[PDB]
Amino acid sequence: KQAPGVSIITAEDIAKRPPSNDLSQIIRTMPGVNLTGNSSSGQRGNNRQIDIRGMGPENTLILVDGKPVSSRNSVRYGWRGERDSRGDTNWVPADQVERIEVIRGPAAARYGNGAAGGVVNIITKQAGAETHGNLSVYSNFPQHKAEGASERMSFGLNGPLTENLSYRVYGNIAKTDSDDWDINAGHESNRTGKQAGTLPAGREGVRNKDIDGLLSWRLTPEQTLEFEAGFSRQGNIYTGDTQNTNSNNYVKQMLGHETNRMYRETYSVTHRGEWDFGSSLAYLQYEKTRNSRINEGLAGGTEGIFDPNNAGFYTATLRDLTAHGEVNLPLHLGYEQTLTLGSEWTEQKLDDPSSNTQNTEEGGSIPGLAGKNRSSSSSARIFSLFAEDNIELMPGTMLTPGLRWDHHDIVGDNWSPSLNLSHALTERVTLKAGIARAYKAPNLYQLNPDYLLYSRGQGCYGQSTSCYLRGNDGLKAETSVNKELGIEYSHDGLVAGLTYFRNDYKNKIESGLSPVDHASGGKGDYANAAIYQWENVPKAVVEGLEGTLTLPLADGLKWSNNLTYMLQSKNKETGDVLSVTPRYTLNSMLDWQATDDLSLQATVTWYGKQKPKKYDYHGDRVTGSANDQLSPYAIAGLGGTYRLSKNLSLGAGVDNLFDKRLFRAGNAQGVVGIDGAGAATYNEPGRTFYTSLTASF
Ligand SMILES: O=C(NCCCCNC(=O)[C@H](CCCCNC(=O)c1cccc(O)c1O)NC(=O)c1cccc(O)c1O)c1cccc(O)c1O
Ligand SMILES: [Fe+3]
């Protein structure tokens, strides 16, 4: 379940540490993985997503059965690098997952665009030779009522209909209540003036509806043809969250209301063929995401708060089209080896009405940008060709080179080579090394010169004068040279391993630091504002350690541990951190199979210290509560699963047994009337009992 670079989570693991609702909860406990924001602002800080090796969650590519999820790219990408999005790990329900694969660093680059951190691939349970199904229910109960409880019901149902014809379907209904609007009261950062009384929000709630159907059709013994369609819906429950933690009356009106809904529809055709020379796979996916939410402002403090002048919903639409071909070729030659050949094509169409609406009446107008009625539409296509060769130099030693070439229709050509070595120093010991250069295509917001934010001063780098920030079709893609060197002892369920990783991070895209221009005209002190773009930041670095250790204490009894230690995370231009992660993270499970029918689990997670950014949006050094750090802390849990028959199991447990709690105080830095909160940007939920029930044939 842990090799160097790679982790599997199984369906059995999902049962022994049941997630509330989102899978991020269990995915984040792998080595190398954190749950964090994309950037340092702390904005939308209770909306944290899976991060691989400190590279940010935009560089974690989420797959379902090998097919991209791109839905979050429908949510506005803000000045400071965040989206008001819960991410893309909540589309498949926990209890219909067969396994999750997490692939980190150099072994992930070959997957291409947006895998600089790595790939997380959520794999669903499939039909068997007979009809099976299941019914899974989960329900939790926080000690403190402020905190939102979660409820989850999902079925699955699968089998043959003819000898050439099979199916699987599932459907899920779930709800995570929001935190009370006031859960952070008395923990909030200092707030004066007109910002007096405002609150850093707790966790947003979500309602889920997921329905998938799959038909697998065996055209020949060697040819399989699959069709599936997916329908999901998430609607939130709002609890006061605003980009800057300021409030108005529209915010309060909606408290408890659904203010955003994502409908996600996937249709896919997949043909899979296994024959003399080897294997073929090819697929078409159409993902259509509709992101309906309340119109928000786009200027300064008003960025990311509901806009009262223009009340009501807009709908942003993402149409994402993915097609993929491979075959593979066993090749007997100088070295016995295996070769893989493939193209990939994608199209991202984005229609977003609210995002390109900022006007130029106050900061003065911008040559080449119309102040009104700018386009909704943005798009990019990448075409890609690749080949991997997997090579047995001598038994138990493997070499895997591959080349990916990608043509982005705007950005141009990218070349992402890779090379992955494993060696058995001993029948017990294995050394692994990898060095790849991964690829990140600028997202459609960064790329678009119709996308325009404005600030009167407070958000402008290197000045207090008003400024604009503008998209930039000139940009280069972000690339990263992800190096990793690791060693693992592995014998009779004793596993002990330690990996060092460094990713050299080139052209990270980010709000720029110097004006490229100045507008002309507009009003008063704010006239002739500065113009900044999205830049490529020349160099950044992340660096750290991953470890695993697994000891069989006796037959009934297994002690497992995963360790992340983050050495460095540095924008080498500004010297500030890229993300806020914990210095280290240790997850420890004890697994007692107390009887053939009772399993018991104890867990602990230790989080290290967390430090905020050094510099504000001006580039100046922060002060007061902006500096505040989060001390190390641990979260422990007990649970069990009691099997009542082959057809019926029960679970129960406690998460956060000693009620260690944390509270979102605000964003990192201070603005006028709103003191910063440093690293205290999220809510850690308290003691929480849970129960569960799984019936299956
Ligand atoms: O005095 C300023 N703005 C006008 C005061 C009335 C606005 N008061 C508000 O409560 C609201 C919300 C203020 C909440 C605190 N501000 C922030 O957290 C903030 C964050 C990032 C960037 C900013 O410019 C911010 O103000 N501001 C606006 O209506 C506003 C409109 C257009 C352009 C802006 O930059 C805005 O902030 C000002 C002066 C220098 C620098 C600024 O960023 C200012 O907003
Ligand atoms: Fe402002």
From Swiss-Prot:
**PROSITE patterns cross-referenced by the UniProt entry:** TONB_DEPENDENT_REC_2, TONB_DEPENDENT_REC_3
Q: Where in the cell is it found?
A: Cell outer membrane
Keywords from the named record: Cell outer membrane, Ion transport, Iron, Iron transport, Membrane, Receptor, Signal, TonB box, Transmembrane, Transmembrane beta strand, Transport
- Recorded GO CC terms: cell outer membrane; outer membrane
Q: Which Gene3D superfamilies match?
A: TonB-dependent receptor, beta-barrel domain, TonB-dependent receptor, plug domain
Principal location: membrane
Give every TBDR plug domain span.
1-125
Query: GO MF terms on file?
Result: colicin transmembrane transporter activity; enterobactin binding; enterobactin transmembrane transporter activity; siderophore uptake transmembrane transporter activity; signaling receptor activity
- Give the observed phenotype of the deletion mutant: In a pvdD and pchEF double mutant background, when grown in iron restricted culture, able to grow in the presence of enterobactin or various synthetic catecholates, but fails to grow when enterobactin receptor pirA is also deleted.
Q: How does it sit in the membrane?
A: Multi-pass membrane protein
Motif (TonB C-terminal box) on chain: 680-697
Is Manganese a UniProt keyword of this protein?
Answer: no
One GO biological process this protein is involved in is: enterobactin transport
**Similarity comment text for this entry:** Belongs to the TonB-dependent receptor family.
The protein's name = Ferric enterobactin receptor
Q: Which organism is it from?
A: Pseudomonas aeruginosa (strain ATCC 15692 / DSM 22644 / CIP 104116 / JCM 14847 / LMG 12228 / 1C / PRS 101 / PAO1)
